[PDB]
Amino acid sequence: LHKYSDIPEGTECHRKAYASTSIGGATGLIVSAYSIALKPPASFLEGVARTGRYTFTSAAIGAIFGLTSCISAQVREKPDDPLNYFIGGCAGGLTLGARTRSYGIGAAACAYMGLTAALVKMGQLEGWQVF
Amino acid sequence: MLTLLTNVTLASLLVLIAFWLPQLNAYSEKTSPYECGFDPMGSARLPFSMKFFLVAITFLLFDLEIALLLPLPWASQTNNLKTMLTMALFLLILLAASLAYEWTQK
Amino acid sequence: MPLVYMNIIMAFAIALAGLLMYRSHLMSSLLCLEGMMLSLFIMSTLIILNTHFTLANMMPIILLVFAACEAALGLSLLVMVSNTYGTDYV
Amino acid sequence: LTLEAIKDRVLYVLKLYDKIDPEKLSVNSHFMKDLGLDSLDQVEIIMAMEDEFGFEIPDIDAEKLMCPQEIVDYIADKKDV
Amino acid sequence: NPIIYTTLIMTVMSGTMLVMISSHWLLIWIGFEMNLLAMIPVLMKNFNPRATEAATKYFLTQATASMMLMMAIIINLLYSGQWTITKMFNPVAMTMMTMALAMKLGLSPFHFWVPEVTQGISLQAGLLLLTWQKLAPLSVLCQISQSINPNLMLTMAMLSILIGGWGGLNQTQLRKIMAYSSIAHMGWMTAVLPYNTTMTILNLLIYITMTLAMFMLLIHSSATTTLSLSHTWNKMPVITSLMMVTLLSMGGLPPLSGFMPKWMIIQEMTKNESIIMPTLMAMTALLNLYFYMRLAYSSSLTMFPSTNNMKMKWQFEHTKQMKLLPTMIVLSTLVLPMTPALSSLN
């Protein structure tokens, strides 16, 4: 995360997008891990099918989020306000919307993932301590 | 370690000269398990008994106790026996006490 | 820390992972737990032998006791579960 | 459990069986009055079919027979479908 | 026979008191260890095919927990040669002592055993399990609050509240619900622990008083499954008419006593900034409240249809009164304008 943190600003969109892809991949492996742990897949090939699913999905979400965010930064060139992430936030849900093949879940995911990201940026701006 | 190795190698040597020597014909039914003549009604399964563990566990919990008894010969030479002696008796009482409790709860 | 200690610690980590991979009839788990116990014992005793921290020469044996003690208890529960089934965790 | 599953299975087990040639097969037709199979075969195939449906057939129901379909009706009577 | 049962329960009391006394670590691990052996048999009274595997669950998890704990102690000693409690001197060890204790409290995601185990035993052994067993591990956490790695603590402290929520909306039979209630309050105790232990101990006292109120009531009515509780409104209306209140005090509606914990906790954490965490926490505590409310609907506020056979039972007064109960209700409710007295706990 420290790697991803040194954006800087939004310069070199790829450098950032790779890192976000990395984080999304990590969380995908964790979710896959507990899912396999608590929902015994039966027939292990199905299990790797499952983990391939989640891993690829979360990695995708991270990628698209990262690059849309940095691109918006390098295009609007505002570039520091929280809304700059929010599009990517809104974008992220759509990615999630695509794999699930459902307008509903994609629609909700757009809004909430967007607001979450916006709060994150707002937090970097304000030094909110969470822990 | 040397005597361990010579002993084990000795025994293993006896094994190898035990098998690779008579040099004769093994065959089926000769190799079938013994059952005082007539064939077994079934392979060994479950000779279950509470009366096994009901005491064997008590073995285990005495053996742990004697494990504490062992330091005693050396502890006997401590500078302050009155501080010790009660305990030297104490555990034994409980050992006995434990047994006593078992003795009569059937 | 000398490599030997690292090796015993790793034997602990395996003595745990074995407990948690956890499969079929559970008697294996009481074994794996006792193995875990033994690794902690040895790892303790090597230390008390190391620094000549003499009083603590008493601990490992005492450790052993209770640890063995709980395992001694554990079989009893297994009996009961064995009593109604012929054991399996399944 | 539709009645069709029951019938399909009855005749399935009776098609798997040897004395009943596929040509010999006929649902309404009385199982003995038409089929040339030995009387023991009733018992063998019924015990197999009930081996599929799983419940023991009391042999008063072996005294049912009449038609295989009436036995299917009894299977409906037990399944209560 | 009672003469043995009482010796067991007293050696449990001793097996915890020992943790609360000794400074040396080895006596603490002995404290838990003795506590365990004396805890299992009391779960096995009456004895059921069910109860047996209940105890199997409990023992299996407590044993592995105690194991990890002793390992982490030994590692601490390896890297500082001490036995006194104090600060630990090696984070790789410290996180494991936190884990071991995390099982001992039943905090999530280690929590899964607690709802199950509660199901397997009678409300007596149940209550005792959800109160007395919660003392010792907290009794050591208060002593190692000084060096805790707060991140690791707040994460389990939160996740205990979410899991203590969502798994609470789903169940019917009360014991499993009481399990998710407790598993949820422990999130609130262990949350504030890094910041200020006195708030923890306050919250602990309220929790114990509360769950004593409930389990004494369930005992008084011998209700279990929710429907079984539903009938009680006609027979001895008072006690259902009192489960309502104690439930609301679980819910922490503000005049009631159960609000005192949360509202001190929110204070403490707020001094630390950390402003977001209590907001999420307090918001989820609502979700915790909701199944207390639904359970209230089954019971007192509305009358599920009575069964006929109940009528003869009307003639027969309940017996074997439990003396300690009325005070456990009242303290767990009305005490709110007596928060400041919390400073007695210094």
Next chain:
Amino acid sequence: LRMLVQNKLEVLNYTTIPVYLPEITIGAHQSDRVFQKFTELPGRKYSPGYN
């Protein structure tokens, strides 16, 4: 077993099991009313020694 013989509601404890067959079960109104009537009796408002 002797403890079970005393405190008879316990021996009765499972006789009021909720299974909700239409013939046994009673709607809340009739039950609330009839029990409201049961209290009307001289010896039932309170535990017997107190009344």
Next chain:
Amino acid sequence: MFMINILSLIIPILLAVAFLTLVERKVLGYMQLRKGPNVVGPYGLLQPIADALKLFTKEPLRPATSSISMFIIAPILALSLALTMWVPLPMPYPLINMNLGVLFMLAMSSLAVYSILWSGWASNSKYALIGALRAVAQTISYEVTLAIILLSVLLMNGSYTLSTLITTQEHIWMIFTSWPLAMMWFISTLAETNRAPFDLTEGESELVSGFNVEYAAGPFAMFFMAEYANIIMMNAFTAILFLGASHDPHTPELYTINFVLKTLALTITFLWIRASYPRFRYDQLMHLLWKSFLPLTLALCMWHISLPIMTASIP
């Protein structure tokens, strides 16, 4: 040249178990009036080697049902430990001066019976399993009292080292001091070694040669052989531990000349027990122990804990 010393410890003892077998049939014979083996000797003497040759020559089948690995590894362990227990034994000079080799004698003795458990487990047969199981019962049941009474007789020698146990017997002998514990030690050696009245592991008529059955030629020779190793060895152990002797360092050999007498005098007695008593049955075998031996072992134990303080006679 330590190796030739070891070899010098291992060959003579195996010879001793062979001739032990022959003596067994001899004495145990004359108790029966009937003469023992004789015709092949002239005094029977050549017999045991003819016997062993008859065994090893004979085919040792690998049972179809048995798992093979355990089935082979068990005998190995039996002779192994049966021999290994001999090393720290002061004759007068121990081959090894263990600081606490007595405790080690207990260690070897305690891993001994585990081999019996495998011997009956891998054998797969019904008789194998049942007999092996009861075997392990009697064995452990006797090792507890075993080790306690050995402790209590060791409080007074001073320490666990063996050579000192000579020094502490430069006059009176331990036995006059604490014979009742010597009785219980004797009988515990009479059961731990699985002998005459405590006969169950072999089972014999009760269970047609017990656990040992499915083993055929060589492995059977190993369990048989190892069994006699333990018998002579616990006998020697009792001898040094309860029967002291004069020991001039300048002539160690003199002492040994005495020692083999004092131990042989024990081993013969087991045989003269074998000719005398019917076996106990698995209930009573454990009854007399848990009910009757043990409490005395404790009372005697506190007593022996307490003498050195009251007598001010600490070793």
Next chain:
Amino acid sequence: TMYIAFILSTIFVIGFVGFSSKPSPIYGGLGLIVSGGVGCGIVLNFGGSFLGLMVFLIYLGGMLVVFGYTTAMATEMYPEVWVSNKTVFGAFVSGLMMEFCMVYYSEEAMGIAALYSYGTWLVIVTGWSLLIGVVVIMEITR
């Protein structure tokens, strides 16, 4: 030097590799036997001989026997050897590669005698504990 204590640690660890894999409790009992003797040897190398012989006596001479009883109560026909399943054997290999990667990478006398005179408290709680443990065994089996 010989590194003999260390190679003993290695055999120890594989003793837990074949042990922690879970192929019928009996063979695991073998696993703790091997790891047991290796253990007492390793602690013997520092010369805490009394302790190594405690474990070689109290543990292996006690425990694994009583486990040699549980299997009589459990067993089930056709117990599995280490080779008898892909996950078990896979597990054993799984341990071997890891530990191999790692390889690729008297005071005592009075010290324990002190337990009685100088440390009565532990004696009290151990006595009490074991006693009431016997009571627990009663109150479960009865």
Next chain:
Amino acid sequence: VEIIFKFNGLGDWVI
């Protein structure tokens, strides 16, 4: 050793 925490290496005797 880089794993978990550092293992100082070399022979056992040294300590």
Next chain:
Amino acid sequence: DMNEAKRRVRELYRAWYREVPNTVHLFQLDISVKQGRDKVREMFMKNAHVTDPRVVDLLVIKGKMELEETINVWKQRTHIMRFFHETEAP
């Protein structure tokens, strides 16, 4: 009267038939698993003309004891293989 006894015998056929694979399994018989069944049917054909009242029920009395024996592992491989007369010269 007849027929009441015929049902008995059918019951008996059910019992024998279903038991047979267990017989081949437990006894390690290498007869074709079918063959025993067929041979059973044949033995059932051997008295397939008996017509007396009591004699047939008496026949199922003598028929019970045999399955009674094979189920109790009484008789043996020899004893149960005996029916096939396999060593006889044609």
